[PDB]
Design a binder for this molecule. Structure first.
Ligand code: 9F7
Length: 238
């Protein structure tokens, strides 16, 4: 996160750190608890991931230093990537991780509500991008979960900013015209959380941008409202 501040413990209890084990263990991406056995993340996070056997999901984490060999995690049973996904810049940058075990809900780990279909018309004014990513382009993964309040941007205004790209309605952008606050390397997969009627909703999944927090370069996010039916299709399968 660029231009953010340290989160407080329990502030984003749906936030998870998705770690890879091959060749050595390291943070890979962010993610959101959306069900007791479901993590919603970005499809691009699995580039060169041969099996879910190398993945470890950590919930209830504020500081990456909380993770050692004795720290408990959730194994990943299945990786479900949207089958229209080619690359982040083309959209469909959404994936579901089905966990081997059930998440025990408490004040340190709980699900974020998905946006309602009737909430496609609502205008969110309190949105936050969270993660353990870089504070600038050439940096390192942060120990403490960072947060940044970012304004939502119209598809039209985002399309002006990304000439040469096709910004679809399945994408949602966020950022200040002058930059300064944004997601960066290590944040992808994580949430873009918006508070509405005292209820947090998963509006976006951190996807891509040209650089980090640049003037007139909004962060591009997967527009979760547009994938509610795809999420239910995979999580509610008979
Ligand atoms: C499959 C491989 C995965 C995802 C690749 C894409 C991802 N993009 C992002 O995380 C965010 C992009 C982005 C998103 C928005 Cl919304 C706006 C502006 C953005 N950026 C544009 N240029 N940089 N960031 C990214 N993550 C890292 C570098 N780049 C990264 C850095 C460090 C570690 N681990 C580490 O040091 O452990 C000790 C792990 C990763 N993970 C990855 O390599």
């Amino acid at each position: 996160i660029v231009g953010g501040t340290a989160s407080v413990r329990g502030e984003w209890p749906w936030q998870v750190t998705l770690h890879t084990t091959s060749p050595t263990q390291r943070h890979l991406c962010g993610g959101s608890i959306i069900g007791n056995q479901w993590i919603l993340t970005a499809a691009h996070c699995f580039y060169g991931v041969e099996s879910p056997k190398i993945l470890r999901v950590y919930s209830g984490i504020l500081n990456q230093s909380e993770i050692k060999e004795d720290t408990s995690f959730f194994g990943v049973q299945e990786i479900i990537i949207h089958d229209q996904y080619k690359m982040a810049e083309s959209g469909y940058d959404i994936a579901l991780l089905k966990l081997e075990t059930t998440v025990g809900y408490g004040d340190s780990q709980r699900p974020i509500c998905l946006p309602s279909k009737g909430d496609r018309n609502v205008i969110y004014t309190d949105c936050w991008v969270t993660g353990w990513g870089y504070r600038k382009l050439r940096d390192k993964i942060q120990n403490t979960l960072q947060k940044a309040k970012i304004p939502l941007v119209t598809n039209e205004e985002c399309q002006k900013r990304y000439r040469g790209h096709k910004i679809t309605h399945k994408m949602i952008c966020a950022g200040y015209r002058e930059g300064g606050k944004d997601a960066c390397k290590g944040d992808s997969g994580g949430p873009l959380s918006c508070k509405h009627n005292e209820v947090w909703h998963l509006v976006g999944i951190t996807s891509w941008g040209e650089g980090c927090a640049q003037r007139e370069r909004p962060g591009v996010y997967t527009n979760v409202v547009e994938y509610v039916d795809w999420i239910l299709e995979k999580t509610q399968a008979v």
